[PDB]
Design a protein around this ligand. Sequence first.
Ligand SMILES: *[C@@H](O)[C@H](C[C@@H]1CCNC1=O)NC(=O)[C@H](CC(C)C)NC(=O)OC[C@@H]1CCC(=O)N1Cc1cccc(Cl)c1
Ligand SMILES: *[C@@H](O)[C@H](C[C@@H]1CCNC1=O)NC(=O)[C@H](CC(C)C)NC(=O)OC[C@@H]1CCC(=O)N1Cc1cccc(Cl)c1
Lengths: 299, 298
Amino acid sequence: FRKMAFPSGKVEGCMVQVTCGTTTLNGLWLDDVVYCPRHVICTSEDMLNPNYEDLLIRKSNHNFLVQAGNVQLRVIGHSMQNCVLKLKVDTANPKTPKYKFVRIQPGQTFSVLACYNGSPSGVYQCAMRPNFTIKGSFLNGSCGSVGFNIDYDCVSFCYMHHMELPTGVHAGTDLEGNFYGPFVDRQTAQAAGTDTTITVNVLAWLYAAVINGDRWFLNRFTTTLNDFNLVAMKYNYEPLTQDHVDILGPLSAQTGIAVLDMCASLKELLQNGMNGRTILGSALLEDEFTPFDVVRQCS
Amino acid sequence: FRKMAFPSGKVEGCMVQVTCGTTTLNGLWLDDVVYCPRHVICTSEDMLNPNYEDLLIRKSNHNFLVQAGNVQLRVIGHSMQNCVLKLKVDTANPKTPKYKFVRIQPGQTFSVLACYNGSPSGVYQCAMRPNFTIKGSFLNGSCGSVGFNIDYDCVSFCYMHHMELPTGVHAGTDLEGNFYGPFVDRQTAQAAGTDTTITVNVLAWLYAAVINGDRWFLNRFTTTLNDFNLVAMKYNYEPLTQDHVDILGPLSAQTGIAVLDMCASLKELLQNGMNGRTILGSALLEDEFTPFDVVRQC
Ligand SMILES: *[C@@H](O)[C@H](C[C@@H]1CCNC1=O)NC(=O)[C@H](CC(C)C)NC(=O)OC[C@@H]1CCC(=O)N1Cc1cccc(Cl)c1
Ligand SMILES: *[C@@H](O)[C@H](C[C@@H]1CCNC1=O)NC(=O)[C@H](CC(C)C)NC(=O)OC[C@@H]1CCC(=O)N1Cc1cccc(Cl)c1
């Protein structure tokens, strides 16, 4: 199993840069709107505890430089939606894909197109941690880079990059400007919750092992979902939700192993350990592959 | 830190579907030529000992169906260079990027755009292994997927996908159709040479772990280059050359850890293991980041 990103070309065709004064970050150009982090309007002094509404009132359309490459896109309207700035521009992006804006759940994976000055540098897959942070590669100027999934020819945009936390992890918003997690777009020190292991993805990984014929860890018993969640919490595993049970349906059907039976198998691994053994060639359980990722690389 | 692929857009605009008989795979459409694996011209029974020159002379242009999305492209010529079929079409690809065809060295990395039925499906980073296999993710229908690097706006194509080995690693050619390694485009079980670990990349990765604040594995021990290489070869690691030491200079400077000091740390890891611990999240030493791959990101 490799971490595999979606092909990035449909998102590359939407990347622009947005500049206020000397501050430049990336924007997303879809139809005749450019979306970017609202802190592009912030000076240094403004970043400690900005009054975004007051800062934006002082802004006019002609204070915003939007460029696709070296080509300027004229701004004809501006508004703020939560922590995202929306810039209406006078040109509809001819490369606009079919798209949606989705807010993902913790544990879900997505591709990030890391971008600097409106130019993509690289693409990689990220899992959103249970504490709503991501472990990316984001250097200065990366804000406004987006995360996405692609289903058929439809791009589901789910993340826009805004900030780094003291531990080195990253935080940002959905494309409606609402942060994932208890974070704010102020340059104050902020703490992520204690992270936990993504239980549903570990379960997907166990299903993947079974699909490949590696099934020593399967036991003859089942469990309740509440029993598992109480036990799992003691090992720093995320409690399972009903949505988690539902997204494991395809893999449960593929293997004939009921979700709660795999939960019992995992409970035993947590309490007893691997006792010298490996799963899929590894002594560690993997938690960054979703049920959907498993089906993509096996089938 | 993060394995990262090049943005794939420039390559996506070149992928098409190529069909001959009941075999469909991917092609690379640059200017007015579509490049693809020649084994598309084989039936099930041909694949066991295929005489490609014979099979090719018996094909006509109309036997090849090339589709760029919803559009069939007309094949007006066909030839073969080593293991790659070249289909001349009547229309030029307006999305052709600036490009070169390069043959990459073992230990170097590249991005793979995995495709099925001419449609891009995923992008990921691979290294050319010392034994000239690659550890990819390729399913039925992936043949003709390509590997590439991007330097400025120029795409250097270095890999085209042909086969899977019984160990689950993968083999293919450069865009001139020459296999990497001792492999042949026939349906026979083929083993690769003994693999070895790309030492300069493991060292680059340790420097990445140090930069990210992981340093439990460092030590005050030191080593000569030859004594390191003696131990490396014992553990089926590649010898480290003076050119590799040179290439690690930027990372050495940045961290203040001499290359030969990092070699002494790696020697201790080979001889002792990691004792339960992990490095950058891994229970295993990773060897598919090059020095350049680490710098670009750190
Ligand atoms: C895009 O403009 C950048 C992206 C940064 C640059 C380096 N890596 C990134 O993720 N975003 C910022 O500069 C933000 C923008 C403001 C409006 C939030 N600023 C930022 O990250 O401030 C410092 C962060 C904010 C939350 C927090 O806890 N911070 C303190 C911090 C974080 C990490 C390390 C250190 Cl030493 C301090
Ligand atoms: C593209 O046409 C593919 C897709 C393959 C199959 C799924 N994953 C892939 O990478 N390649 C092929 O079908 C080749 C075509 C011939 C003309 C080389 N064949 C192939 O890869 O299958 C047989 C391989 C070839 C070398 C070898 O060792 N093979 C025997 C083998 C390997 C692994 C498992 C099994 Cl059951 C047999």
